[PDB]
């Protein structure tokens, strides 16, 4: 099946990504708090709902929160400033708080139930967000010789996510706070730049263009 692309709201960031966030892939964004990774997650949750000539996939979003990062008022603000109805937009974002890493895994199995239910409807799930994908794993699998088991548990969690991306043609978008192995399809580093901008760089991505994107955090979420 064809790869779908979700616009980030920034033409600059979309160009760096080769056209937007891809379905059938895990895109991992990482950086410090306020680097834009969570603002990007909130923006994609709105953008995915738009038709394709507006950069979306006529879809709905699922948001797994591990650190209380989800702000329904921010989705509302982004929707209203893009000409959309905030109540309808929020209704197309299914949210869950993950209490620990094991609950996070169970939430991914429940996500599959909703994705299956909506697959052949007019508004299928097209984006699954996991914000701070590693926070619970790093908090729980810690101490002497914990690296091996944390990496095995994370490898399995990422394999379940890759399966949902590829099997149901959805984009999986995950975030992380800053020599370890990583299994995301695409890794993007975000940082705060000069003049209130955010700068994005692709990590280990020769398959895509050399360069960096510059974008802003605005009342529309993410834009140039």
């Amino acid at each position: 099946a064809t790869i779908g692309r979700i616009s980030t709201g920034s033409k600059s960031l979309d160009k760096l990504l080769g056209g937007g966030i891809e379905t059938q892939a895990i895109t991992e964004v990482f950086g410090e708090f306020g680097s834009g990774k969570t603002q990007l997650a909130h923006t994609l949750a709105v953008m995915v709902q738009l038709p394709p000539e507006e950069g979306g996939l006529n879809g709905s979003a699922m948001y797994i929160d591990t650190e209380n990062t989800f702000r329904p008022e921010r989705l509302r603000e982004i929707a209203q400033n893009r000409g959309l109805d905030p109540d309808e937009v929020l209704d197309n974002v299914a949210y869950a708080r993950a209490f620990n890493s094991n609950h996070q895994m169970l939430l991914v199995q429940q996500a599959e139930d909703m994705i299956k239910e909506l697959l052949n409807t007019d508004r299928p799930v097209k984006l699954l967000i996991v914000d701070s994908l590693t926070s619970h794993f790093r908090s729980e699998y810690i101490g002497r010789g914990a690296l091996a088991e944390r990496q095995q548990k994370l490898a399995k969690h990422l394999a379940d996510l890759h399966r949902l991306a590829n099997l149901y043609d959805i984009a999986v978008f995950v975030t992380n706070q800053v020599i370890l192995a990583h299994s995301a399809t695409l890794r993007v580093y975000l940082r705060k730049g000069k003049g209130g901008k955010r700068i994005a760089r692709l990590i280990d991505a020769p398959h895509l263009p050399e360069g960096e994107a510059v974008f802003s955090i605005t009342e529309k979420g993410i834009e140039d």
Binding site: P72, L90, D91, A94, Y95, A96, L107, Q110, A111, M114
Partner: peptide, 4 residues
Amino acid sequence: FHTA
């Protein structure tokens, strides 16, 4: 999950 629950609707936002």
